[PDB]
Scaffold this active site. Structure first.
Site, short mmCIF file in Angstrom:
data_model
loop_
_atom_site.label_atom_id
_atom_site.label_comp_id
_atom_site.label_asym_id
_atom_site.label_seq_id
_atom_site.Cartn_x
_atom_site.Cartn_y
_atom_site.Cartn_z
N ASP A 137 29.57 32.60 46.13
CA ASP A 137 30.42 33.01 45.00
C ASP A 137 30.09 32.12 43.79
O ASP A 137 30.02 30.90 43.94
CB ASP A 137 31.90 32.88 45.36
CG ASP A 137 32.39 34.02 46.23
OD1 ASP A 137 31.60 34.62 46.98
OD2 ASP A 137 33.60 34.33 46.15
N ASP A 157 38.53 46.38 50.87
CA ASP A 157 39.49 45.51 51.54
C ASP A 157 40.44 46.37 52.37
O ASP A 157 40.97 47.34 51.86
CB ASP A 157 40.33 44.70 50.56
CG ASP A 157 39.55 43.61 49.88
OD1 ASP A 157 38.40 43.36 50.26
OD2 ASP A 157 40.13 42.99 48.97
NA NA Z 1 30.32 31.28 49.92
#
Ligand code: NA
Length: 231
Positions: A7, A122
């Site tokens: 990320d 999700d």
């Molecule tokens: Na990660």
């Protein structure tokens, strides 16, 4: 396969926030050196503001490894998809837009091809045992099930789905959906805390296992993850 993940916020590797430094390329290069065949990146800066999409960084990272990278984070428009592909990414990961505007996204399948797109959903298991889709962990359910949304996209040749469980149960979830749609390659995301969690996903039918934080935390290496996966 194992799919190592980072990320990224303004060039910084983060865990979901803890800062793991500003060296994403050497990290990704070492993931590939250990045998990874696919990598995953989330552009958190782009997700908060598409105007600031980290295209130059993404270009550098893709160029710097020899494996396909799938990249997500605030993909809202056809222009976003095109820009990422032009930068050299292998596949674009589409999240909330695949829930909110399915006719628009079906058009992207027709333009770019199913091999270029991953739908990230999700899933929250409700009181009844239904697999409910939600656009994020902090928003309520969207009123469509995983099965119903998958079937929306099968007519345009859907091939790749990334499923994150945001509600034992985990393993059963993947066993059920993989069995129902064997023509789709499902990727699992979340819930990997140690090497045994990877073992548990074996034989469920999942094709890919996203692994992010456990690598950053030094719980196990990409090489160890692949050896476990290959059994
Ligand atoms: Na990660």
């Amino acid at each position: 396969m194992i799919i190592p993940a980072l990320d990224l916020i303004d060039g910084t590797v983060v865990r979901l926030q803890r800062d793991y430094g500003n060296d994403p390329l050497p990290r990704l290069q070492d993931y590939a050196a250990q045998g990874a065949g696919v990598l995953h990146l989330v552009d958190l800066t782009g997700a908060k503001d598409p105007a600031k999409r980290q295209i130059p960084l993404i270009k550098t990272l893709v160029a710097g490894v020899n494996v396909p990278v799938q990249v997500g984070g605030g993909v809202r428009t056809e222009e976003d998809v095109a820009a990422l592909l032009k930068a050299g990414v292998a596949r674009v990961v589409i999240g909330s837009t695949a829930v909110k505007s399915p006719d628009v996204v079906k058009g992207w399948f027709e333009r770019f091809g199913a091999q270029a797109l991953v739908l990230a959903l999700d899933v929250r298991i409700d009181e009844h045992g239904t697999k409910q889709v939600a656009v994020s962990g902090w928003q309520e359910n969207s009123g469509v099930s995983l099965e119903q949304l998958v079937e929306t996209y099968l007519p345009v040749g859907l091939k790749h789905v990334l499923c994150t469980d945001i509600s034992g149960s985990n393993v059963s979830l993947y066993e059920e959906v993989c069995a129902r749609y064997p023509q789709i390659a499902f990727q699992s995301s979340g819930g990997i805390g140690d090497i045994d969690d990877i073992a548990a996903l074996r034989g469920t039918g999942v094709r890919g296992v996203i692994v992010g934080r456990a690598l950053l935390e030094g719980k196990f290496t990409v090489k160890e993850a692949i050896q476990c996966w290959q059994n």
